[PDB]
Amino acid sequence: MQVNRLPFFTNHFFDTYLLISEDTPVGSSVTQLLARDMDNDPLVFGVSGEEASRFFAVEPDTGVVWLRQPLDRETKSEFTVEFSVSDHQGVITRKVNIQVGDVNDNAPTFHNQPYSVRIPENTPVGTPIFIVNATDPDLGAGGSVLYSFQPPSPFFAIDSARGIVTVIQELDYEVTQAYQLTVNATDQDKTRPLSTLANLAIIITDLE
């Protein structure tokens, strides 16, 4: 007799990877599973696995794969997903690597606040007194932070790439005993930069 011929997948992505942008809206089709059954049997498609089934859903008859929950590359940057196809006599599965594509969706975050430093009034021009650090988990320019004072200061400077704060004019405890500066950390996304502000207190101490 004839033995049933099981279906097999014909998508090219099973051998490489599927890319899905993290800004993909829920409900969006992310691909369509394609399969052949040489008996011309009607086929039913699925996704298997607890995590995969949470994030992705599959139209049983058409094989269209849907986004069921929002993606977030900064929480999980890829998935290994098992898809199935069945002619109702047997079930064939195959795995695909899904890469989550980055969008610039995070502002920088400053660590180890509150920021404060005490320096003596004879601290000379050029002296580094504080290093600010903000991180940005996005990729490329959207993850590359630049620092500035906003508003600017005539007494202190901050290195835009390194976050190193230096004295740029002589200090004088009699004139000013404290400064309140605002550091801006911005990513360098070309279309939609995101930024964050942090306070820096510089306290001047008198020699005696």
Positions in the binding site for Cl ion (CB under 5 A) = 8-9, 94
Query: Which of Cl ion, Na ion, Ca ion, none sits in contact with 68, Cβ below 5 to 8 A by type?
Result: none
The answer to the question of residue 136 lying near Ca ion (CB under 5 A) is: yes
Identity of the residue, 8 or 17, whose beta carbon is nearer to Cl ion in the bound complex? 8
Query: Which of Ca ion, Cl ion, Na ion, none sits in contact with 17, Cβ below 5 to 8 A by type?
Result: none
Binding mask 120-139 toward Na ion (x if CB under 5 A, else -) reads: ----------------x---
Region 99-118 residues binding Ca ion, contact defined as CB under 5 A: 102, 104-106
The answer to the question of residue 23 lying near Na ion (CB under 5 A) is: no
Q: Which residues contact 174 (CB under 8 A, 6 or more apart)?
A: none
Torsion, CA 47, CA 52, CA 57, CA 61, rounded to 10: -10
* Smallest separation (angstroms) from Ca ion to the CB of 89: 6
> Is the CB of residue 33 less than 8 Å from the CB of residue 9?
yes
Query: Which of Na ion, Ca ion, Cl ion, none sits in contact with 39, Cβ below 5 to 8 A by type?
Result: Ca ion
**What is the C-alpha separation between 169 and 159, in angstroms, rounded?**
16
> Is the CB of residue 45 less than 8 Å from the CB of residue 60?
yes
> Is the CB of residue 97 less than 8 Å from the CB of residue 17?
yes
Region 1-20 residues binding Ca ion, contact defined as CB under 5 A: 4-5
Binding mask 56-75 toward Na ion (x if CB under 5 A, else -) reads: ----------------x-x-
The answer to the question of residue 53 lying near Na ion (CB under 5 A) is: yes
**What is the C-alpha separation between 181 and 21, in angstroms, rounded?**
38
Sheet holding 156-158, edge to edge: 128-131, 164-167, 156-158
**What is the C-alpha separation between 13 and 84, in angstroms, rounded?**
14
**What is the C-alpha separation between 19 and 11, in angstroms, rounded?**
14
Residues of the shown chain interacting with Na ion in the complex, contacts defined by CB under 5 A: 47, 53, 72, 74, 105, 136, 143
Residues within the interface to Ca ion (CB under 5 A) = 4-5, 37, 39, 41, 73, 87, 102, 104-106, 136, 138, 142, 187, 194
